């Protein structure tokens, strides 16, 4: 179901990000996530994997290669749950032929905002709203850290959209 | 004005166990990869350990692993090394830095270093 | 991640050229940072890179008597962070 289609997500945000940031597991990072809080989880074990890198601007490419490159291989009425993805977790009202520049504007122009640029705080927080699951089995996930506070903010963006798509 | 105050090495038997401390003075300890690197008598520059800024993120080397255990409390300013289940390669004289976060990752502070000699 | 330094033993007199290198089996990038050990003390930083990686050098050229000691090299991103062998220099009288 849909965590079928977040560990492809999960696995093609860490292979480009290690051949387009030559990223690794190994390797130190510039911002590290202190604490992963999410207000009302029902059912996901949401994981901070490490994954940092050097390029902020490539790390920001990688994450938007890998969730458009994902979008596509959506069948054509599993597309359609996303317009709805958006306006719940960035009341971007957006449409199916809308969403993949939509986010990449929103990711562009908001990540590279001298808000997140100059953070200076190197142990961030991730707070997301809320996620749901079965009891036997949760929705797996990950948040990929990937050094930087603009890069971490595309994949905060990514993940309050995923964790928007189990309700 | 920067310094690294190593403390707790000595003389141990096989097997034995010591805690070594590093007080940090002179920065924002809250924002630096802290380290553990061991030098052997004569020759030799070696990584034990490093630990993030959270102490959320842990790594060892190979020889050193299952066995020793770093830390770091952010409040009292210190870094620790517990050395558990000793043997003779671990002797060695024990520094503490501080990875340059803030600039290039290296290490540029060292602290003047603990003896540790395992024999029985 | 293996560090093989060379030469393990180098010695030019005052106001001459040594060169030492910090040969990688894997690519490291640009990530080397070099070390001087006195002889009997912590270890002090000299130069440092961030941003291939097989081959790098270090050319100390003014030299002075004040440093003789021992050379270290060192991958400043990947764990495990591996130093090299070292090399000491001595300058001739």
């Known amino acids: 179901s849909i965590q079928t289609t977040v560990n492809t997500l999960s696995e093609r945000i860490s292979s480009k990000l290690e051949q387009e940031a030559n990223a690794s597991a190994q390797t130190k990072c510039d911002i590290e996530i202190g604490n992963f809080y999410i207000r009302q989880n029902h059912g996901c074990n949401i994981t901070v994997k490490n994954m940092c890198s050097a390029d902020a601007d490539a790390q920001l490419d990688a994450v938007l290669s890998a969730a458009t490159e994902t979008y596509s291989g959506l069948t054509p009425e599993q597309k359609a749950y996303v317009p709805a993805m958006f306006t719940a977790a960035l009341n971007i009202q957006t449409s199916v032929n809308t969403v993949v520049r939509d986010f990449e504007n929103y990711v562009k122009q908001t990540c590279n905002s001298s808000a997140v640029v100059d953070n200076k705080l190197k142990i961030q927080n991730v707070i997301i709203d809320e996620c749901y699951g079965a009891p036997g089995s949760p929705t797996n996930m990950e948040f990929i850290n990937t050094g930087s506070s603009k890069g971490n903010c595309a994949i905060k963006a990514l993940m309050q959209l995923t964790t928007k798509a189990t309700t | 004005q920067v310094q690294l105050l190593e403390s707790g090495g000595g003389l141990v038997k096989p097997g034995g166990s010591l805690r070594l401390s590093c007080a940090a003075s002179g920065f924002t300890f809250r924002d630096y990869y802290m380290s553990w690197i061991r030098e052997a008598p004569g020759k030799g520059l070696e990584w034990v350990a490093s630990?993030?800024?959270?102490?959320?993120?842990?790594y060892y080397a190979d020889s050193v692993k299952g066995r020793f255990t770093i830390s770091r409390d952010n409040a009292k300013n210190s870094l620790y090394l517990q050395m558990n289940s000793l043997r003779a390669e671990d002797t060695a004289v024990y520094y503490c830095?501080?990875?340059?976060?803030?600039?290039?990752?290296?290490?540029?502070?060292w602290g003047q270093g603990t003896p540790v000699t395992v024999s029985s | 991640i293996q560090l093989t330094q060379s030469p393990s033993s180098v010695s030019a007199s005052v106001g001459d050229g040594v060169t030492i290198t910090c040969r990688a089996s894997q690519p490291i990038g640009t990530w080397v940072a070099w070390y001087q050990q006195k002889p009997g003390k912590a270890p002090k930083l000299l130069i440092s890179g961030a941003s291939s990686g097989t081959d790098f050098t270090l050319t100390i050229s003014s030299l002075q008597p004040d440093d003789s000691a021992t050379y270290f090299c060192?991958?400043?991103?990947?764990?495990?962070?591996?130093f090299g062998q070292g090399t000491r220099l001595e300058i001739k009288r």
């Open positions: 060192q991958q400043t991103n990947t764990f495990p962070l591996t």
């Open positions: 630990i993030s800024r959270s102490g959320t993120t842990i």
């Open positions: 830095a501080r990875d340059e976060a803030s600039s290039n990752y290296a290490f540029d502070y």
